Amino acid sequence: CPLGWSSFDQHCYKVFEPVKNWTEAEEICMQQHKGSRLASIHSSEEEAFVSKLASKALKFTSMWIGLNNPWKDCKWEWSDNARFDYKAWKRRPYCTVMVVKPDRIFWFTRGCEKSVSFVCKFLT
């Protein structure tokens, strides 16, 4: 991997500290290299590596990962099976943040407009 990027299973990763909202973070990742985007996390092993990497780069270890809108394409249904049409669900776009604690790692969601540090990834 290039200077500043760390290697893990044929991919290159890099954590960026300066906070940004999800979309600008994604753009910034795409600019750094071909095939680079906010990191998708496919297993606990990949997750562990990215977490240790973040701990070295971030004082406040929270970072955007590649999951924008976990509630995209949901299929809302009424328990009485009435047809779903009228709706008052108006949640704005939310994005995923990976948090690294001393005893564990977990993900939670925040408005995509919030500013968070982030991590990029691309196939070598």
Binding site: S40, H42, E47, L67, K72, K75, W78, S79, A88, W107
Partner: protein, 131 residues
């Protein structure tokens, strides 16, 4: 008419339940405490205003949501099928409470708007059945 203390609206009967239960337990309660009962389904703005008035008493309590019968029934913890990069979402690691696949009325809008929240969380709710 409606039985006991249930309130009528557009040919249905409704009842606000103060004892908190998770979404599944609330739905079951509604099925057990009323003939063909279920957590409330809200199919129009008018019905929503009626339900909001029905639960106006919960504005003083600490609970910020009231269960309604809407949810995504899948086994998965979220809906989006893919990561930003196109790969499939399979492995996920949500903190407790961060998988939100059931819906409830929101206290901030005086119980008019709905929000998806943790199905296992405990909240008061509303039952509905056809008269």
């Amino acid at each position: 008419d409606c039985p006991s203390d249930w309130t009528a609206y557009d040919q249905h009967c409704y009842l606000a339940i103060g004892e908190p239960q998770n979404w599944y337990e609330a739905e079951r309660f509604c099925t057990e405490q009323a003939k063909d009962g279920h957590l409330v389904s809200i199919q129009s703005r008018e019905e929503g205003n009626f339900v909001a008035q029905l639960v106006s008493g919960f504005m003083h309590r600490s609970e910020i949501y009231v269960w309604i019968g809407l949810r995504d029934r899948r086994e998965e913890q979220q809906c989006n099928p893919e990561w930003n990069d196109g790969s499939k979402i399979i492995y996920v690691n949500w903190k407790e409470g961060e998988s939100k696949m059931c819906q409830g009325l929101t206290k901030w809008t005086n119980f008019h708007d709905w929000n998806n929240i943790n199905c296992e969380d405990l909240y008061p709710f509303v039952c509905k059945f056809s008269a």
